[PDB]
Design a protein around this ligand. Structure first.
Ligand code: HEM
Length: 154
């Protein structure tokens, strides 16, 4: 699949707003992910002990992790589809070390869309959401392909 320049513009326009507060968006996304799909928390040995949203918001380590995640995703989105190099290390670690199924990548994609919709309604109308969904679907499609090459069914 391929996004048009117009669709990429919608994606990068709202992403520019996210970048005004990377740490805050990361926390919101994780909290949404862990509350909606608790099973995903079990994959994080360093955070699986967190019991409440309050503890999650107070975790300095979780905040730092969120920044790393959004920074990596932002770098990929900014490549506008030409992300082969960026995807390699990410696919290898998540398939071989962390063992993250594609289903969980779908769950975090849902959390990202939920948070953007909540925080940036003016820059996340129907067309913008459609573009972001398309960008995330492309990301998941390419990661899934790499997973297969690496020997992980995902
Ligand atoms: C938006 C998609 C995602 C991106 C861009 C992303 C990115 C990253 C990055 C950059 C790291 C640090 C370096 C590395 O180990 O590769 C990382 C670590 C990790 N990721 Fe992800 N990730 C994503 C989704 C997920 C999901 C959905 C899960 C599981 C529910 C997950 C589980 C982990 C774990 C367990 C670690 C290691 C954390 C630690 O060091 O304690 N990731 N991720």
């Amino acid at each position: 699949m391929v996004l048009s320049e117009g669709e990429w513009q919608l994606v990068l326009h709202v992403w520019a707003k996210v970048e005004a507060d990377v740490a805050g968006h990361g926390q919101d996304i994780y909290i949404r992910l862990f509350k909606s799909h608790p099973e995903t928390l079990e994959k994080f040995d360093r955070f699986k002990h967190l019991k409440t949203e309050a503890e999650m918001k107070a975790s300095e380590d979780l905040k730092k992790q969120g920044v790393r995640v959004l920074t990596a995703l932002g770098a990929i989105l900014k490549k506008k589809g030409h992300h082969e190099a960026e995807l390699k290390p990410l696919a290898q670690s998540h398939a071989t070390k962390h063992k993250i199924p594609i289903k969980y990548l779908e769950f975090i994609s849902e959390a990202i869309i939920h948070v953007l919709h909540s925080r940036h309604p003016g820059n996340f109308g129907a067309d913008a959401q459609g573009a972001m969904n398309k960008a995330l679907e492309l990301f998941r499609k390419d990661i899934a392909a790499k997973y297969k090459e690496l020997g992980y069914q995902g």
